[PDB]
């Protein structure tokens, strides 16, 4: 059982120190591997759209999830960013500046989209929501 | 509305007022004039004037 002695302060403190590493949440923050992620601890990131791609939805669903391969400007890492809403892929062109954000599960895949943990928030400095609702238009043409 | 509060000073004479009263409060009552000046221009004149020695300091445009 537990050590109970009044003079056992060191053992109890050191035991907990070792055992906190067994906790996945604790180890994910104190390992230091978060800095090696594409965002490197940031909430958002800008990147350049390399190509427009489609990803087969995971089973038992059946669809083609419209994504976009993006290279991050600050570190040059390539990621797959899901483009939400209906027909918003038409608002994205290759070699375009897009603001990326997490998908909502802190680096974990979401939904039936396989191996996708990012989504597109802005394109050419304009939010996809504004373009989807016809609030604004992309700055070109 | 219907009530205001302020602060008042009564000086024994206008001569004592001009000694102890700040300049801006004398201009309000008309007991003094306002010398119009630009602080930034005065600073640039100071820095231009200290590159010259002697009586030419003033003549430096």
């Amino acid at each position: 059982g537990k050590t109970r002695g009044m003079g056992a302060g060191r053992k109890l403190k050191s035991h907990r120190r070792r055992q906190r590493w067994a906790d996945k949440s604790y180890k994910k923050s104190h390992l230091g591997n978060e800095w090696k992620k594409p965002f490197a601890g940031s909430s958002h990131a800008k990147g350049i759209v390399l190509e427009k791609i489609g990803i087969e939805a995971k089973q038992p669903n059946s669809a083609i999830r419209k994504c976009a391969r993006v290279q991050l400007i600050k570190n040059g890492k390539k990621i797959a960013a899901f483009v939400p809403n209906d027909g918003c892929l038409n608002y994205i062109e290759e070699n375009d500046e897009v603001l990326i954000a997490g998908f909502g599960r802190k680096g974990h895949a979401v939904g039936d989209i396989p191996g996708v943990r990012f989504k597109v928030v802005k394109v050419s400095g304009v939010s996809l929501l504004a373009l989807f609702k016809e609030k604004k238009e992309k700055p070109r043409s | 509305g219907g009530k205001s509060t302020g602060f008042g000073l009564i000086y024994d004479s206008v001569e004592n007022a001009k000694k102890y009263e700040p300049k801006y409060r004398l201009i309000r009552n008309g007991l003094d004039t306002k010398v119009e000046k630009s602080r930034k221009q005065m600073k640039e004149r100071k820095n231009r004037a200290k590159k010259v020695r002697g009586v030419k300091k003033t003549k430096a445009g």
């Binding site: 427009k52 990803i55 087969e56 083609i64 419209k66 209906d86 027909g87 892929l89 038409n90 | -």
Partner: protein, 48 residues
Amino acid sequence: GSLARAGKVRGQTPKVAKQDKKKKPRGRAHKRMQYNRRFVTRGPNSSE
């Protein structure tokens, strides 16, 4: 996969303009009608 069908359904949907109607009260007035319609006088949106 094929990316040619992106925006398919949203483009097919026939456009229907919104019907302009009298606005509702704001703030305290809104909470007044919301209070009379639930305490003073099936769900709120039942298809009765």
